[PDB]
CSV table of C-alpha atoms in Angstrom, one decimal:
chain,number,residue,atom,x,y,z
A,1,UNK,CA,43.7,84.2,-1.2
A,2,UNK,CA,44.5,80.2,-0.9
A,3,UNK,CA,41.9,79.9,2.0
A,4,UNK,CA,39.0,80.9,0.2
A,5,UNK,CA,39.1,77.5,-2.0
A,6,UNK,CA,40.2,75.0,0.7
A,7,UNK,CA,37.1,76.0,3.1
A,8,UNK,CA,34.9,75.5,-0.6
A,9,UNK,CA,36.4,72.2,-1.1
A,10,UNK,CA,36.0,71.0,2.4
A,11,UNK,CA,32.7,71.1,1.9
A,12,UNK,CA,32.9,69.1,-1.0
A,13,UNK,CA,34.6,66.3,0.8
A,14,UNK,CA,31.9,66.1,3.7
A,15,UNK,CA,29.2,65.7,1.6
A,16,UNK,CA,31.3,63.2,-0.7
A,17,UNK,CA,32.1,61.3,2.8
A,18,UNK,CA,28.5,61.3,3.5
A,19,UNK,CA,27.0,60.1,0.7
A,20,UNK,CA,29.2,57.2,0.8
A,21,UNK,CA,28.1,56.1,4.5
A,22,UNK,CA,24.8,56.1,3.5
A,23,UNK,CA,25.0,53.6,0.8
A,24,UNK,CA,26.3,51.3,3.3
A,25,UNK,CA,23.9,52.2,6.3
A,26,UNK,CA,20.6,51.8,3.7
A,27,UNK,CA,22.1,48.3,3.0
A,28,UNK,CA,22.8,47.1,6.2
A,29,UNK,CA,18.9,47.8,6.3
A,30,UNK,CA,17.9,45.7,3.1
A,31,UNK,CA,20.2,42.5,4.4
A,32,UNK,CA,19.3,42.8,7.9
A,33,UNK,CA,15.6,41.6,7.3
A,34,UNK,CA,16.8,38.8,4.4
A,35,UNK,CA,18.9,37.4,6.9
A,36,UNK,CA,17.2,37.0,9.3
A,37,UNK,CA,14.1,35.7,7.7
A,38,UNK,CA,16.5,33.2,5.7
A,39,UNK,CA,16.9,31.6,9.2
A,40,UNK,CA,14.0,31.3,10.5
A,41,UNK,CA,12.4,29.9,7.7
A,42,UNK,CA,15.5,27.2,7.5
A,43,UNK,CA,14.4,26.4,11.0
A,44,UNK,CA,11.1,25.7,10.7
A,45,UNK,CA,11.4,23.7,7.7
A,46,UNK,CA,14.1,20.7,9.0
A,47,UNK,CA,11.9,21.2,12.5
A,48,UNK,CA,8.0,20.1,11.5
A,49,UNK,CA,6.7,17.2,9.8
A,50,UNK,CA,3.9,14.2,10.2
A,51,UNK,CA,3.9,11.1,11.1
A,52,UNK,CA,1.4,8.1,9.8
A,53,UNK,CA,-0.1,5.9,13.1
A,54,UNK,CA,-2.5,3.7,11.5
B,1,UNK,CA,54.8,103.9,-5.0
B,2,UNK,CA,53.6,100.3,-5.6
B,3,UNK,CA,55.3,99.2,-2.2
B,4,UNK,CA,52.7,100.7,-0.1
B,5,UNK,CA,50.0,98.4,-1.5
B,6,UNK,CA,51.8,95.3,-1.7
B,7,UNK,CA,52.2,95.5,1.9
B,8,UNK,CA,49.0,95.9,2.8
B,9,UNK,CA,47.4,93.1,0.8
B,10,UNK,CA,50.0,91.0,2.4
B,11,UNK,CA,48.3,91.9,6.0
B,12,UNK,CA,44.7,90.7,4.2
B,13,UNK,CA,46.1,87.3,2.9
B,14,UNK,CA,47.9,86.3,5.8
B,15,UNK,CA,44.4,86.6,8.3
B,16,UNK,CA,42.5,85.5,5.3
B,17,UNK,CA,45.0,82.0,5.5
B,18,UNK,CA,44.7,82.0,9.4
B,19,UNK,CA,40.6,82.1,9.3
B,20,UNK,CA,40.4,79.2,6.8
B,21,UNK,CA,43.4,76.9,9.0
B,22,UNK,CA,40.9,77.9,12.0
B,23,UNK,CA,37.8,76.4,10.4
B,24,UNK,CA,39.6,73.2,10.0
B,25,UNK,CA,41.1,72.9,13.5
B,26,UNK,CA,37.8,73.5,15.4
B,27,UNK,CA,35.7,70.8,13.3
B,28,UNK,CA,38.8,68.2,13.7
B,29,UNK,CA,38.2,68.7,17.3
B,30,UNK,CA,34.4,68.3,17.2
B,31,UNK,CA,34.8,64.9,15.1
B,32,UNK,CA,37.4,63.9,17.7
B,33,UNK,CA,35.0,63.3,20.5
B,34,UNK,CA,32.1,61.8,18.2
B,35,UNK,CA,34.2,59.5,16.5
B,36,UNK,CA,35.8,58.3,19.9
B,37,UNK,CA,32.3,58.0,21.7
B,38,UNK,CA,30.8,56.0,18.7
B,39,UNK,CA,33.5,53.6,18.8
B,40,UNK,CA,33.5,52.6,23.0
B,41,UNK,CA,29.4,52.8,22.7
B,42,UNK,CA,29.2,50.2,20.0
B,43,UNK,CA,32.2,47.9,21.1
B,44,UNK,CA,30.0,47.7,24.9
B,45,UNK,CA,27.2,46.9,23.5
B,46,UNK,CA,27.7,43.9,21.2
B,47,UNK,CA,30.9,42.9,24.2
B,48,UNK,CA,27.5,42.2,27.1
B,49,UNK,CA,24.9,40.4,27.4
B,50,UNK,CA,22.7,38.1,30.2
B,51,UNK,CA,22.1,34.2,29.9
B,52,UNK,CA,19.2,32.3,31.5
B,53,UNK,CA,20.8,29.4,33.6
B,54,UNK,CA,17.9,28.0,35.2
């Protein structure tokens, strides 16, 4: 019968479709903290500094 | 006669074709609602937000 393969290769496709979110998910991760650090860093830099009195 | 058998094999493929088509029907409709749900949710949530005016 046809079915038996089409459930068999559903399968297949899910886990396909799954493993290509996660790529995506895991890098979100990875950029979210170089981001954000990349600005704070910035900010801190242009916003400190000394000054000479005397 | 070879008849006889080709008819009942016929019964077997046809259910056997109707279970698999099922399989695929009921998980289209499960995905439905979560796919739906995750979209509204995440539109919301980056749409709001509170400002301090004073």
């Amino acid at each position: 019968a046809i079915g038996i393969g089409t459930l068999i290769i559903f399968i297949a496709m899910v886990l396909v479709a799954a493993v290509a979110a996660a790529v995506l998910i895991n890098t979100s991760g990875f950029l979210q903290q170089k981001a954000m650090a990349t600005g704070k860093e910035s900010t801190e830099q242009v916003a400190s500094g000394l000054q000479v009195i005397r």
